[PDB]
């Protein structure tokens, strides 16, 4: 059962999968504290036109560096980065680096906005385990439309220790980004706006890396696929099938979740993935030489876990056309032992309860909306504490992928009121988003560490998030804690606020954008030592 497609008919599987280019830093600045190099980047948020339908008009987008997806960052563990996000668009922005324990003022607090004609310098630690992060807009009440129109990109945190694992490698070669979105188009090929949608924006056109229903030519060997659900509201149940046997699911392995590698690969033939979740998959095409393998999406609202509307072609994601032979021998492997996962110390303390539902017309957490400044701070947790949170969806009529900032967490338990599922094998490691499917209650366990500050948690269905399913917690310290905590706990701290710029000095790379000015600014930021407590 599915609904007729609304968007114009598209030429299925005729356009190759695009690969976002790697973003290169402009320069490096010596950290005056420790003498190590900090990589500095400039990203310009700007409108651009993109022809999605070959035979129609074009779509109006707004993206990081004028592309969508934004360019891919590739940063080694231990190297701090500063990214200057320059707003040259027409709406405010707030960048969230999802997956990073950034300080509160560098984390994308929804009120911490940059207006057009201003920029903000974000200072990132890059100390956590190798993982696929992503960076995307988070501006209050306009997050769905900003993300939908193109403000999302990948940020890979790498670790040379994992290179010894000899997994399939090479960005855009055998290590392939798979950014999933679900959108809708007008009869003339422009995007249909999410504005006015207060329930969920499902979309009827499935994209990978910004392209509707692409294909990729692949060799008959192993590939690493980095899946991200960057959709506004659509959740997926991904499986692979030979086009000659479209209903036989082909096995694959999940090797990583939001926060990094699993302890062991999880043998999988169906991957549930909801908004903002990342899973890394290895698929072996070697038994399918000369065949076409279709990446598909489970119907019936993700097999009854979700409520998503299904359309004529939302069961299709993309096609892999497998060559008869490899160019070079495949010498990659998937080891049985991937890593020691750094789970938090377990706690017996009663889980803190959070309920995700509606209060009248508004999506809420414990009956509160983010707009409610006096009531949105729902938890105080001393830094260093391990807490379990019980995340409750009592409803059959919505589902909610919940994101908690700052932390990595372990999924402890899931109970479905429909008896649909419990904890999945690929939820065995550490995560930062967890899907509350229909009538699901999930307990997660997290170390609220190592940095004090006020942070968000929310549903990552961006329609729900905007109206208004988002709250905050404060990871607290005592007054004698030190570490310059006083200037790093408040996300709106004036020191770190956006600053105005003139387009001339930006394009000329002078004034505030001269090497000297950038150097002085970054060296000043570095002296405050924001990430020292992790060292
Ligand atoms: C989130 O938790 C923060 C603690 O981790 C808390 O910051 C603390 O706020 C108190 C009260 O504003 C400050 O206490 C002192 O502040 C000035 C400075 O001397 C004094 O004049 C006051 O009389 C008071 O004694 C703490 O200094 C401050 N701690 C830090 C590390 O900044 C935040 O207020 C909490 N945020 C929210 C939104 O609740
Ligand atoms: C706090 O920041 C100031 C100003 O940048 C710096 O001089 C000082 O060393 C920092 N102290 C700590 C404990 O990080
Ligand atoms: Cu996110
Ligand atoms: Cu939700
Ligand atoms: Cu968030």
Coordinates of C-alpha atoms and ligand atoms in Angstrom, one line a residue:
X1 CA 0.0 0.0 0.0
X2 CA 1.4 3.3 -1.2
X3 CA 0.2 6.7 -2.4
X4 CA 0.6 8.1 -5.9
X5 CA 3.7 10.1 -6.5
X6 CA 3.1 13.8 -6.5
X7 CA 6.4 15.1 -7.9
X8 CA 7.0 14.8 -11.7
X9 CA 8.1 11.5 -13.1
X10 CA 11.9 11.2 -12.9
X11 CA 14.3 9.2 -15.2
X12 CA 15.2 6.5 -12.7
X13 CA 18.8 5.4 -12.2
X14 CA 20.3 7.3 -15.1
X15 CA 22.5 9.9 -13.3
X16 CA 25.7 8.7 -11.5
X17 CA 26.0 9.1 -7.8
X18 CA 27.7 12.4 -7.0
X19 CA 30.5 12.5 -4.4
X20 CA 30.9 15.7 -2.4
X21 CA 34.4 17.2 -2.7
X22 CA 36.7 17.2 0.2
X23 CA 36.9 20.6 1.9
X24 CA 40.5 21.8 2.3
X25 CA 41.6 24.2 5.0
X26 CA 42.8 27.6 4.0
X27 CA 45.7 27.7 6.4
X28 CA 47.0 26.5 9.7
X29 CA 47.6 28.5 12.9
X30 CA 50.1 27.6 15.6
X31 CA 48.4 27.0 19.0
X32 CA 50.4 29.3 21.3
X33 CA 49.6 27.0 24.3
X34 CA 51.1 23.8 22.9
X35 CA 52.8 24.6 19.6
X36 CA 50.5 22.3 17.6
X37 CA 48.8 23.4 14.3
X38 CA 45.1 24.3 14.2
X39 CA 43.5 23.9 10.8
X40 CA 41.4 26.9 9.7
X41 CA 38.5 26.7 7.2
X42 CA 36.1 29.3 5.6
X43 CA 32.7 28.1 4.5
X44 CA 30.3 30.5 2.7
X45 CA 26.6 29.8 3.1
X46 CA 25.0 31.0 -0.1
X47 CA 22.0 30.5 -2.5
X48 CA 22.5 28.6 -5.7
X49 CA 20.4 27.1 -8.5
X50 CA 20.5 23.4 -9.2
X51 CA 18.9 21.5 -12.1
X52 CA 17.4 18.4 -10.6
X53 CA 15.0 17.4 -13.4
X54 CA 16.7 17.3 -16.8
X55 CA 13.7 18.5 -18.8
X56 CA 12.2 21.0 -16.4
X57 CA 13.2 24.2 -14.6
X58 CA 15.7 24.3 -11.7
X59 CA 15.5 24.2 -7.9
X60 CA 16.4 27.1 -5.5
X61 CA 18.9 25.8 -2.9
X62 CA 21.0 27.4 -0.1
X63 CA 24.1 25.5 0.9
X64 CA 27.6 25.4 2.5
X65 CA 30.0 26.7 -0.2
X66 CA 27.0 26.9 -2.6
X67 CA 26.6 23.2 -2.9
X68 CA 24.4 20.4 -1.5
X69 CA 25.6 18.2 0.2
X70 CA 28.2 20.6 1.6
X71 CA 31.8 19.6 1.1
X72 CA 33.2 16.8 3.2
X73 CA 35.6 17.6 6.0
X74 CA 38.4 15.0 6.7
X75 CA 40.1 15.6 10.0
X76 CA 42.5 13.4 12.0
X77 CA 41.9 12.8 15.7
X78 CA 43.8 15.3 17.8
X79 CA 43.9 18.1 15.3
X80 CA 41.8 21.1 16.4
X81 CA 39.9 22.9 13.7
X82 CA 38.3 26.4 13.5
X83 CA 35.6 26.8 10.9
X84 CA 34.4 30.3 10.0
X85 CA 30.9 29.9 8.7
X86 CA 30.1 33.0 6.7
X87 CA 26.4 33.8 6.1
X88 CA 25.9 35.2 2.7
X89 CA 22.3 34.1 2.4
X90 CA 18.9 35.6 3.4
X91 CA 18.0 33.8 6.6
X92 CA 19.9 33.2 9.8
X93 CA 21.9 30.1 10.5
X94 CA 23.3 28.2 13.4
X95 CA 25.8 25.3 12.7
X96 CA 25.6 22.1 14.6
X97 CA 28.5 19.7 14.3
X98 CA 26.6 16.5 15.1
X99 CA 28.7 13.9 16.8
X100 CA 31.2 16.3 18.4
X101 CA 31.5 17.2 22.2
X102 CA 32.0 20.9 21.3
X103 CA 31.7 23.6 23.9
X104 CA 28.2 25.0 24.3
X105 CA 28.9 28.1 22.3
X106 CA 30.3 26.1 19.4
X107 CA 27.6 23.4 19.4
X108 CA 24.8 25.0 17.3
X109 CA 22.5 26.2 20.1
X110 CA 19.2 27.1 18.3
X111 CA 19.2 30.7 19.5
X112 CA 23.0 31.2 18.8
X113 CA 22.4 32.5 15.3
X114 CA 24.4 34.2 12.6
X115 CA 22.5 36.8 10.6
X116 CA 23.2 37.5 6.9
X117 CA 26.2 39.7 6.6
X118 CA 27.8 38.1 9.7
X119 CA 30.1 35.1 10.3
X120 CA 30.9 32.9 13.4
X121 CA 34.1 31.1 14.2
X122 CA 33.4 27.5 15.5
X123 CA 36.3 25.9 17.5
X124 CA 36.1 22.1 17.4
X125 CA 38.1 19.6 19.5
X126 CA 38.3 16.5 17.2
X127 CA 39.4 14.3 20.1
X128 CA 36.7 11.7 20.1
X129 CA 36.8 8.2 18.4
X130 CA 36.9 8.1 14.6
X131 CA 33.3 8.4 13.5
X132 CA 31.2 9.9 10.7
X133 CA 30.0 13.3 12.0
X134 CA 27.8 15.7 10.0
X135 CA 27.3 19.4 10.1
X136 CA 23.9 21.0 9.5
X137 CA 21.8 24.0 10.3
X138 CA 20.1 24.3 13.7
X139 CA 18.6 27.8 13.7
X140 CA 15.5 28.1 15.9
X141 CA 12.2 27.4 14.1
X142 CA 13.7 27.3 10.6
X143 CA 15.9 24.2 10.9
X144 CA 13.7 22.0 8.7
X145 CA 13.7 24.5 5.8
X146 CA 17.4 25.3 6.1
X147 CA 18.4 21.7 6.2
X148 CA 16.0 20.8 3.4
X149 CA 17.2 23.5 1.1
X150 CA 20.8 22.2 1.5
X151 CA 22.6 23.1 4.7
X152 CA 24.0 19.6 5.6
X153 CA 27.4 18.1 4.9
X154 CA 29.7 15.3 6.2
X155 CA 32.6 15.6 8.6
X156 CA 34.8 12.5 8.9
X157 CA 36.9 12.2 12.0
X158 CA 39.7 9.8 11.2
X159 CA 42.2 7.7 13.3
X160 CA 45.3 6.1 11.9
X161 CA 44.8 3.3 14.4
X162 CA 41.7 2.2 12.5
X163 CA 43.6 2.1 9.2
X164 CA 45.4 -1.0 10.4
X165 CA 42.0 -2.7 10.2
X166 CA 42.3 -2.7 6.4
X167 CA 38.7 -2.0 5.8
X168 CA 37.7 -0.9 2.3
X169 CA 39.2 2.6 1.8
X170 CA 39.6 5.7 -0.2
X171 CA 37.0 8.5 -0.1
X172 CA 35.0 8.2 -3.3
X173 CA 36.8 5.1 -4.3
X174 CA 35.8 2.2 -2.0
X175 CA 34.7 4.4 0.9
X176 CA 31.5 6.0 -0.3
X177 CA 29.3 8.6 1.4
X178 CA 25.6 7.8 1.3
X179 CA 23.6 10.8 2.4
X180 CA 19.9 10.1 2.2
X181 CA 17.2 12.7 1.7
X182 CA 13.5 12.6 0.8
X183 CA 12.0 15.7 -0.9
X184 CA 9.1 16.8 -3.1
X185 CA 9.2 18.8 -6.3
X186 CA 6.8 21.1 -8.2
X187 CA 5.6 20.5 -11.7
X188 CA 8.4 22.8 -12.9
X189 CA 11.2 21.1 -11.0
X190 CA 11.6 23.4 -8.0
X191 CA 11.5 22.2 -4.4
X192 CA 8.2 22.1 -2.6
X193 CA 8.7 24.1 0.6
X194 CA 8.4 22.5 4.1
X195 CA 6.8 25.7 5.3
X196 CA 3.2 25.1 6.4
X197 CA 3.9 21.4 7.3
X198 CA 3.3 20.9 11.0
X199 CA 3.0 17.1 11.2
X200 CA 5.8 15.6 9.0
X201 CA 7.3 16.2 5.6
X202 CA 7.7 12.8 4.1
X203 CA 8.8 13.6 0.6
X204 CA 8.2 11.3 -2.4
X205 CA 11.6 11.6 -4.2
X206 CA 14.5 9.7 -2.6
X207 CA 18.0 11.2 -3.1
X208 CA 21.5 10.0 -2.4
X209 CA 24.0 12.8 -2.1
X210 CA 21.6 15.3 -3.5
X211 CA 20.6 13.2 -6.6
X212 CA 17.3 11.5 -7.1
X213 CA 17.5 7.8 -7.6
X214 CA 21.1 7.6 -8.9
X215 CA 23.2 4.7 -10.1
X216 CA 26.8 3.8 -9.4
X217 CA 29.1 1.5 -11.4
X218 CA 30.9 -0.7 -8.9
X219 CA 33.5 -3.5 -9.1
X220 CA 32.7 -7.0 -7.8
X221 CA 34.4 -6.4 -4.4
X222 CA 33.9 -4.9 -1.0
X223 CA 32.8 -1.3 -0.4
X224 CA 32.4 0.8 2.7
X225 CA 29.2 2.8 2.7
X226 CA 28.6 5.6 5.1
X227 CA 24.9 6.0 5.5
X228 CA 23.4 9.2 6.9
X229 CA 19.6 9.9 7.1
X230 CA 19.6 13.6 6.5
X231 CA 15.9 13.7 5.6
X232 CA 13.5 16.1 7.2
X233 CA 11.1 13.4 8.4
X234 CA 11.6 10.1 6.5
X235 CA 13.0 7.1 8.2
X236 CA 14.3 4.1 6.2
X237 CA 14.5 0.3 6.3
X238 CA 17.4 -0.3 3.9
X239 CA 18.0 -3.6 2.2
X240 CA 20.0 -4.8 -0.9
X241 CA 18.4 -7.0 -3.6
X242 CA 19.4 -8.3 -7.0
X243 CA 17.1 -6.8 -9.7
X244 CA 16.5 -10.4 -10.9
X245 CA 15.2 -11.3 -7.4
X246 CA 13.9 -8.0 -6.0
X247 CA 12.6 -9.6 -2.8
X248 CA 15.5 -11.6 -1.7
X249 CA 17.5 -9.5 0.8
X250 CA 21.2 -9.8 0.5
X251 CA 23.3 -10.0 3.7
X252 CA 25.8 -7.2 4.6
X253 CA 27.7 -6.1 7.6
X254 CA 27.3 -3.0 9.8
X255 CA 30.7 -1.9 11.2
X256 CA 29.9 1.4 12.8
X257 CA 27.2 3.5 14.4
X258 CA 26.9 7.2 15.3
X259 CA 29.9 7.3 17.6
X260 CA 32.2 5.0 15.9
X261 CA 33.0 1.4 15.2
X262 CA 31.1 -1.5 16.7
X263 CA 32.9 -4.0 18.8
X264 CA 32.3 -6.6 16.1
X265 CA 30.6 -6.4 12.7
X266 CA 26.9 -7.0 12.8
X267 CA 25.6 -9.3 10.2
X268 CA 22.5 -7.7 8.8
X269 CA 20.0 -7.9 5.9
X270 CA 17.8 -5.0 7.0
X271 CA 19.0 -1.7 8.4
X272 CA 16.6 0.6 10.3
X273 CA 17.9 4.1 10.0
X274 CA 16.1 7.3 11.2
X275 CA 16.9 11.0 11.0
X276 CA 20.4 11.9 11.9
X277 CA 21.6 8.4 12.5
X278 CA 24.8 7.2 10.9
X279 CA 25.7 3.6 10.1
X280 CA 28.6 2.4 8.2
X281 CA 28.1 -0.7 6.1
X282 CA 30.4 -3.0 4.2
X283 CA 28.7 -4.7 1.2
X284 CA 30.5 -7.4 -0.8
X285 CA 29.6 -7.2 -4.5
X286 CA 32.0 -10.1 -5.4
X287 CA 29.3 -12.7 -5.6
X288 CA 27.2 -10.5 -7.9
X289 CA 29.6 -9.8 -10.8
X290 CA 27.7 -8.7 -13.9
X291 CA 24.5 -8.1 -11.9
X292 CA 22.6 -5.0 -10.8
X293 CA 21.9 -4.6 -7.1
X294 CA 19.2 -2.3 -6.0
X295 CA 19.3 -0.5 -2.7
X296 CA 15.7 -0.5 -1.5
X297 CA 13.6 0.9 1.3
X298 CA 11.1 -1.2 3.3
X299 CA 7.5 -0.2 2.7
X300 CA 4.5 -0.3 5.1
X301 CA 5.9 2.6 7.0
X302 CA 9.3 0.9 7.6
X303 CA 7.6 -2.5 8.3
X304 CA 5.3 -0.9 10.9
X305 CA 8.1 0.7 13.0
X306 CA 7.3 4.1 11.6
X307 CA 4.2 6.1 10.4
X308 CA 5.9 7.4 7.2
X309 CA 3.8 7.7 4.1
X310 CA 5.0 5.5 1.3
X311 CA 4.7 6.6 -2.4
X312 CA 5.1 4.9 -5.8
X313 CA 8.9 5.0 -5.8
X314 CA 10.0 5.6 -2.2
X315 CA 10.8 1.9 -2.0
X316 CA 13.7 2.6 -4.4
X317 CA 17.0 4.3 -3.3
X318 CA 19.6 3.6 -6.0
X319 CA 21.2 1.0 -8.2
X320 CA 24.7 -0.5 -8.2
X321 CA 25.8 -1.9 -11.6
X322 CA 28.4 -4.5 -10.9
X323 CA 31.3 -5.0 -13.4
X324 CA 32.3 -8.5 -14.5
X325 CA 35.7 -8.2 -12.9
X326 CA 37.9 -6.1 -10.6
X327 CA 40.6 -3.8 -11.9
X328 CA 43.0 -4.7 -9.0
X329 CA 42.6 -7.5 -6.4
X330 CA 40.5 -6.7 -3.3
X331 CA 42.9 -6.9 -0.4
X332 CA 40.6 -5.3 2.1
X333 CA 39.0 -7.2 5.0
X334 CA 36.4 -6.9 7.7
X335 CA 38.0 -8.1 10.9
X336 CA 35.9 -9.9 13.5
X337 CA 37.3 -7.6 16.2
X338 CA 36.9 -3.9 15.3
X339 CA 37.6 -2.0 18.5
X340 CA 37.2 -1.9 22.2
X341 CA 34.1 0.3 22.6
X342 CA 34.4 2.9 25.5
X343 CA 31.1 2.2 27.2
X344 CA 30.2 4.3 30.2
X345 CA 30.5 2.9 33.7
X346 CA 27.0 1.3 34.3
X347 CA 24.5 2.9 36.7
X348 CA 21.7 1.4 38.9
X349 CA 20.1 4.8 39.5
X350 CA 16.5 5.2 38.4
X351 CA 16.4 6.5 34.8
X352 CA 15.2 10.1 34.2
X353 CA 12.0 10.0 32.2
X354 CA 11.3 12.1 29.1
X355 CA 8.0 11.9 27.2
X356 CA 7.8 12.8 23.5
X357 CA 4.3 13.7 22.3
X358 CA 1.9 16.5 21.6
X359 CA 0.5 19.2 23.8
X360 CA -2.4 20.6 21.9
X361 CA -1.0 21.5 18.5
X362 CA 2.6 21.5 19.6
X363 CA 5.3 18.8 19.6
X364 CA 6.7 18.7 23.1
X365 CA 9.1 17.1 25.6
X366 CA 7.5 16.5 29.0
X367 CA 4.8 19.0 27.9
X368 CA 7.2 21.8 27.2
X369 CA 8.2 23.6 24.0
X370 CA 11.6 25.1 23.3
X371 CA 10.1 28.5 22.9
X372 CA 9.3 28.4 26.6
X373 CA 12.5 30.0 27.9
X374 CA 11.7 29.6 31.6
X375 CA 10.8 25.9 31.4
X376 CA 12.9 24.3 28.7
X377 CA 15.8 23.4 31.0
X378 CA 14.7 19.9 31.9
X379 CA 17.7 18.4 33.6
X380 CA 20.8 19.4 35.7
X381 CA 23.5 16.7 35.5
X382 CA 26.9 17.2 37.3
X383 CA 29.8 16.7 35.0
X384 CA 31.2 13.2 35.3
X385 CA 27.9 11.6 36.2
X386 CA 26.6 8.6 34.3
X387 CA 22.8 8.7 33.9
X388 CA 20.2 6.5 32.3
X389 CA 17.4 8.3 30.5
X390 CA 14.1 6.6 29.7
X391 CA 12.9 8.0 26.4
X392 CA 9.2 7.4 26.0
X393 CA 6.9 7.4 23.0
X394 CA 3.4 6.5 24.1
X395 CA 1.9 7.2 20.7
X396 CA 1.1 5.0 17.7
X397 CA 0.7 8.1 15.6
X398 CA 4.3 9.4 15.5
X399 CA 7.9 8.3 15.8
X400 CA 10.8 10.2 17.2
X401 CA 14.5 9.8 16.7
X402 CA 16.0 11.5 19.8
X403 CA 19.3 13.3 19.8
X404 CA 21.2 14.2 23.0
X405 CA 24.0 16.7 22.4
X406 CA 27.5 16.4 24.1
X407 CA 27.2 12.7 24.9
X408 CA 27.7 9.3 23.4
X409 CA 25.3 6.7 24.8
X410 CA 24.7 3.0 25.0
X411 CA 21.2 1.7 24.1
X412 CA 20.2 -0.3 27.2
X413 CA 16.7 -1.5 26.2
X414 CA 13.7 -1.1 23.9
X415 CA 10.1 -2.2 24.5
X416 CA 7.5 -1.9 21.7
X417 CA 3.9 -1.8 22.6
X418 CA 3.3 -3.4 19.3
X419 CA 5.8 -6.2 20.1
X420 CA 7.7 -5.1 17.0
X421 CA 11.3 -5.3 18.1
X422 CA 13.8 -4.8 20.9
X423 CA 17.5 -3.6 20.7
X424 CA 19.0 -4.1 17.3
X425 CA 22.4 -5.8 16.8
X426 CA 23.8 -2.7 15.2
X427 CA 22.8 -0.7 18.3
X428 CA 25.4 -2.7 20.2
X429 CA 28.0 0.2 20.4
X430 CA 27.7 3.9 21.1
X431 CA 25.2 6.2 19.5
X432 CA 23.9 9.8 19.8
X433 CA 20.5 9.4 18.1
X434 CA 18.0 6.6 18.9
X435 CA 14.7 5.9 17.1
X436 CA 11.6 5.7 19.2
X437 CA 9.3 3.8 16.8
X438 CA 5.6 3.4 17.3
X439 CA 4.8 2.9 21.0
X440 CA 8.5 2.4 21.9
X441 CA 10.2 3.2 25.2
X442 CA 14.0 3.2 25.1
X443 CA 16.5 3.5 27.9
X444 CA 20.0 4.9 27.1
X445 CA 23.0 5.2 29.3
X446 CA 25.5 8.1 29.0
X447 CA 28.5 9.7 30.7
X448 CA 27.8 13.4 30.9
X449 CA 31.3 14.4 30.4
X450 CA 33.8 16.0 30.1
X451 CA 32.7 19.6 29.6
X452 CA 30.2 21.8 31.5
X453 CA 27.6 23.8 29.6
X454 CA 24.0 24.1 28.5
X455 CA 23.2 21.7 25.6
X456 CA 20.2 20.7 23.6
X457 CA 18.3 17.5 23.2
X458 CA 15.4 17.0 20.8
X459 CA 13.6 14.9 18.3
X460 CA 15.5 15.0 14.9
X461 CA 12.4 14.9 12.8
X462 CA 12.9 18.5 11.8
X463 CA 9.2 19.3 11.5
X464 CA 8.8 18.1 15.1
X465 CA 11.9 19.9 16.2
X466 CA 10.7 23.3 14.8
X467 CA 7.3 23.0 16.4
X468 CA 8.6 22.6 19.1
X469 CA 10.1 19.3 20.4
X470 CA 13.4 20.5 21.8
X471 CA 14.7 21.1 25.4
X472 CA 18.0 21.6 27.2
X473 CA 20.1 20.2 30.0
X474 CA 22.9 21.7 32.0
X475 CA 26.0 19.7 32.6
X476 CA 27.1 21.4 35.8
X477 CA 30.2 22.1 37.8
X478 CA 30.9 23.7 41.2
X479 CA 32.2 27.3 41.4
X480 CA 35.9 26.2 42.0
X481 CA 36.1 23.9 39.0
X482 CA 38.3 26.2 36.9
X483 CA 39.1 25.4 33.2
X484 CA 37.6 28.8 32.2
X485 CA 34.2 27.3 32.7
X486 CA 32.6 30.7 33.3
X487 CA 33.1 31.7 29.7
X488 CA 32.2 28.3 28.2
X489 CA 28.9 27.2 29.9
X490 CA 26.5 29.7 28.3
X491 CA 26.0 29.1 24.6
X492 CA 25.1 32.8 24.0
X493 CA 28.3 34.1 25.6
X494 CA 29.3 37.4 23.9
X495 CA 32.9 36.4 23.4
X496 CA 31.9 33.7 20.9
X497 CA 29.0 35.5 19.2
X498 CA 28.8 36.1 15.4
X499 CA 30.5 39.2 14.0
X500 CA 29.6 41.4 11.0
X501 CA 31.7 41.3 7.8
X502 CA 31.8 43.2 4.5
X503 CA 31.7 41.1 1.3
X504 CA 34.7 43.0 -0.1
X505 CA 37.1 42.0 2.7
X506 CA 35.9 38.4 2.4
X507 CA 36.5 38.2 -1.3
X508 CA 39.8 40.1 -1.0
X509 CA 40.9 37.9 2.0
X510 CA 41.9 41.1 3.8
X511 CA 40.7 43.0 6.9
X512 CA 39.1 40.5 9.2
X513 CA 40.1 37.8 6.7
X514 CA 43.8 38.7 6.4
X515 CA 46.2 36.0 7.5
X516 CA 47.3 38.2 10.4
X517 CA 43.7 38.8 11.6
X518 CA 42.7 35.2 11.4
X519 CA 45.9 34.2 13.2
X520 CA 45.4 36.7 16.0
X521 CA 41.8 35.6 16.5
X522 CA 42.5 31.9 16.6
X523 CA 45.5 32.3 18.9
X524 CA 43.3 34.4 21.3
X525 CA 40.6 31.7 21.2
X526 CA 43.2 29.0 21.8
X527 CA 44.5 30.7 24.9
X528 CA 41.1 30.2 26.7
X529 CA 41.9 26.4 26.4
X530 CA 38.3 25.2 25.8
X531 CA 39.1 21.5 25.5
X532 CA 41.9 21.1 28.1
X533 CA 39.7 19.0 30.4
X534 CA 39.7 16.2 27.7
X535 CA 43.5 16.1 28.0
Ligands
LIG1 C1 24.3 25.9 34.2 O1 25.2 25.5 35.3 C2 26.3 26.4 35.5 C3 27.2 25.8 36.5 O2 27.9 24.7 35.9 C4 25.7 27.8 36.0 O3 26.7 28.7 36.2 C5 26.9 29.2 37.5 O4 26.0 30.2 37.7 C6 26.1 30.8 39.0 C7 24.9 31.7 39.2 O5 24.8 32.6 38.1 C8 27.4 31.4 39.2 O6 27.6 31.8 40.6 C9 28.1 33.1 40.9 O7 28.2 34.0 39.8 C10 28.8 35.3 40.1 C11 30.3 35.2 39.8 O8 31.0 35.4 41.0 C12 28.5 35.7 41.6 O9 28.4 37.2 41.6 C13 27.1 35.1 42.0 O10 26.7 35.7 43.3 C14 27.2 33.6 42.1 O11 27.8 33.3 43.4 C15 28.6 30.5 38.9 O12 29.8 31.2 38.8 C16 28.3 29.8 37.5 N1 29.3 28.8 37.2 C17 30.0 28.8 36.1 C18 31.1 27.7 36.0 O13 29.9 29.6 35.2 C19 24.7 28.3 35.0 O14 24.0 29.4 35.6 C20 23.6 27.2 34.6 N2 22.8 27.7 33.5 C21 21.5 27.8 33.5 C22 20.8 28.3 32.3 O15 20.8 27.3 34.5
LIG2 C1 41.6 31.1 30.7 O1 41.6 32.1 29.6 C2 42.6 33.1 29.8 C3 42.3 34.1 28.7 O2 42.5 33.5 27.4 C4 43.9 32.5 29.8 O3 44.9 33.5 29.9 C5 44.1 31.4 30.9 O4 45.3 30.8 30.8 C6 42.9 30.4 30.8 N1 42.9 29.6 32.0 C7 42.6 28.3 32.0 C8 42.7 27.6 33.3 O5 42.3 27.7 30.9
LIG3 CU1 22.0 16.7 14.0
LIG4 CU1 9.6 13.6 16.7
LIG5 CU1 20.5 19.3 18.0

